[PDB]
Amino acid sequence: QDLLDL
Amino acid sequence: DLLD
Amino acid sequence: QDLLDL
Amino acid sequence: AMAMSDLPIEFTELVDLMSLGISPQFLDFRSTTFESDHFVTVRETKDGTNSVAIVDLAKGNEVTRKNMGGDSAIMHPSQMVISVRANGTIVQIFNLETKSKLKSFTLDEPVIFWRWLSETTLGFVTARSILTSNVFDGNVNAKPQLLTLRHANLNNTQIINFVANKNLDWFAVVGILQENGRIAGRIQLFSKQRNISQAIDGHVAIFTNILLEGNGSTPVQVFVTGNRNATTGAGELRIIEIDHDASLPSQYQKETTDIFFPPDATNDFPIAVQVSEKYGIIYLLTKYGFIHLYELETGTNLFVNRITAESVFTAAPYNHENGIACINKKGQVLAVEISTSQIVPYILNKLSNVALALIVATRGGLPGAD
């Protein structure tokens, strides 16, 4: 999962 | 090769 | 102790 | 509080990626890499036969598209060199103007994150180790030299940054994790000559230099780090000296400054930090799009402004490391740079502002009005 893309 |  | 006071 | 026009900074749009045919699905931190203000690299995974778009921001945003078979690709800060990795294990670095394969090798454990530490050196982070490679050394089949092991505080985080100083003997690896509904940041600091690491909290890190009064023309090394506490919401910027030279009389006095977050941005956090050594300016960018300009010697916030409504997911230095560029979720690459030719008008307006404020204070309870 991409945290910066939340 | 991953590119050409 | 630590490298820096951070 | 202020508009872009009234602040002494210039705002540019270097490119609209979406006006170049770049699909919005590839505008994320892992698909669009931003290593400097020279190239933007978009990995288009679309039907197995993946492609890469290299957007040359210098030569009028020229798009060089080639089919590639990897799961990550990045460009050099200034040269026409592309590094490509597949399965996290097979790595291949090519010069695109000589058609020559600069590097080709296979790691034992996969690489989670990589970034160019300098014009000569490329850094790797795996699930457990931190490695570094001199890709211009001439040894094509040379695997990267191990730098150190990952500190435990970085476990169960996603590594988002890897920074070094100019001497390549101080390093910082930045990972983030999800905590208390917000995003918390962890940093591993590493001194290579001491072979020692240190664990701190932080979302952003950079190494830079600053000339202090009395030290002649010899700079002093400082480490800049920004953090927002996932529990309390308190945000802090810290500037601390590294490896002071005793022959220098003046040393940098540690500075800590509060980072401002408006009431609507409770889930915001710092995403980038860049420093202009020439002007002594710290640019701190947040994920929501707020830019903060701090003065380097004192850490004092010069101003805060919102440069975009769409979230940003990656940034880089701009001009000749005098400003900051970023890519927002829409695909706009926006650049912010202080402009000294605008500081005098800005000062004149602030002086008018304080004169007026004085007058209204005399209308209140300040001795005046004659």
Author numbering:
A (entry chain F), C (entry chain D): 2 to 7
B (entry chain G): 3 to 6
D (entry chain A): -2 to 367
Could you pull the original sentences from the published paper?
The protein that gives the process its name, Clathrin, is a triskelion composed of three heavy chains (Clathrin Heavy Chain, Chc) that provide the structural backbone of the lattice, further stabilized and regulated by three light chains (Clathrin Light Chain, Clc). The proximal domain specifically interacts with Clcs, whereas, the N-terminal domain (NTD) of Chc, which adopts a WD40 beta-propeller structure, is pivotal for interactions with various adaptor proteins (APs). To investigate the existence of binding sites present in Clathrin NTD, we crystallized the N-terminal domain of Chc with different peptides derived from adaptor proteins containing CBMs. All our structures show that each peptide binds to three different binding pockets (Clathrin, Arrestin and W-box).
Crystal structure of Chc-NTD (displayed as a grey cartoon) bound to CBMs from Ent1 (1.75 Å, red), Ent2 (1.74 Å, yellow), Ent5 (Ent5.1 LIDL motif, 2.01 Å, green), Apl2.1 (Apl2.1 LLDLF motif, 2.75 Å, blue) and Yap1801 (1.95 Å, grey). The NTD structures for all complexes are very similar with Cɑ RMSDs between 0.36 Å and 0.64 Å (compared to Ent2 as reference between residues 5 and 336: Ent1 = 0.64 Å, Ent5 = 0.57 Å, YAP1801 = 0.36 Å and APL2 = 0.53 Å) with the exception of the structure in complex with Apl2 that shows the formation of a terminal helix (residues 337–363), transitioning from a helix-turn-helix configuration to an extended, straight helix. An unexpected structural difference observed for the crystal complex with Apl2.1 is the formation of a terminal helix, enabled by the dimerization of two NTD molecules. The presence of alternative secondary structure elements could introduce differences in the overall stability of the Chc complexes or could suggest a mechanism for transmitting signals from the N-terminal domain to the Chc repeat region. Additionally, K98 interacts with position −2 of the motif as observed in the Ent5.1, Apl2.1 and Yap1801 complexes. Concurrently, K326 forms hydrogen bonds with the peptide backbone at positions +2, +4 and +1 for the Ent5.1, Apl2.1 and Yap1801 complexes. Water-mediated interactions are also observed in the W-box between the NTD backbone (L24, D25 and V309) and the peptide at position +3, for both Ent1 and Ent2. However, Apl2.1 and Yap1801 do not show density compatible with water molecules near the binding sites. In addition, the substitution of Ile (from the LIDL motif) for Leu further reduces the binding affinity of Apl2.1 (residues 718-726) for NTD (KDApp ≅ 245 µM).
